[PDB]
Amino acid sequence: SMSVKKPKRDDSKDLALCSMILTEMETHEDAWPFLLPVNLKLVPGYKKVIKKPMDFSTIREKLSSGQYPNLETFALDVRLVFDNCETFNEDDSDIGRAGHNMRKYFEKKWTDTFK
C-alpha cells in the first residue's frame, strides 16, 4: 500500500532474457506455423474466428520497440499464439501438434528462467 512495498525484484535483465527465450522459440524446428502472421486474405475463417492474432514476428517487433510493459505481458502474447493455434487446429494435425510442442517448450524455459 502507500509507502509500504515488498522488496524490489531485479527486473533489469527481463528484456534480454525474454529476447533469448523468443530466439529459442524462433529457431525451434516446429516454429514454422508461428513465425509470421496468418494470412487473413488466404485462410478462410481466421479473421472472424481468431479475435486477437499473434505470431513470433509480431512479438519480436513489440519486444524490440518497448511495447511490453513487463515480462507477464510478454508471456500473455506467447501463450496467445498457442491458444489461437488450439482454437483453429485439430490436436491430430501437424500444426496442432506443433502448437502443443512449442507451448511445452516455452513453459519450461519460462519456469527455468524466472521461477
Technique that determined the structure: X-ray
State which residues form the domain around 63: 1-115
72-81 long-range contacts, CB within 8 A, separation 24+: 74/18, 75/110, 78/22, 78/25, 78/106, 79/103, 79/106, 80/52, 80/54, 81/34, 81/54, 81/55, 81/56
How far apart CA 22 and CA 100 sit, in angstroms, is 16
What resolution in Å is listed for this PDB structure? 1.9
Measured at the alpha carbon of residue 72, what is the angle toward residues 83 and 102, in degrees to the nearest 5? 40
At which residue does the C-alpha cell 492474432 appear?
53
> What whole-number distance in Å separates Cα of residue 37 and Cα of residue 61?
12
Transcribe 3-59 into DSSP letters: T--------TTHHHHHHHHHHHHHHSGGGGGGSS---TTTSTTHHHH-SS---HHHH
CATH code, domain with 95: 1.20.920.10
36 vs 85: CA distance, rounded Å: 13
Smallest CA-to-CA distance from 113 within 66, 78, 62, 64 is with: 78
Biggest CA-to-CA distance, the chain: 54
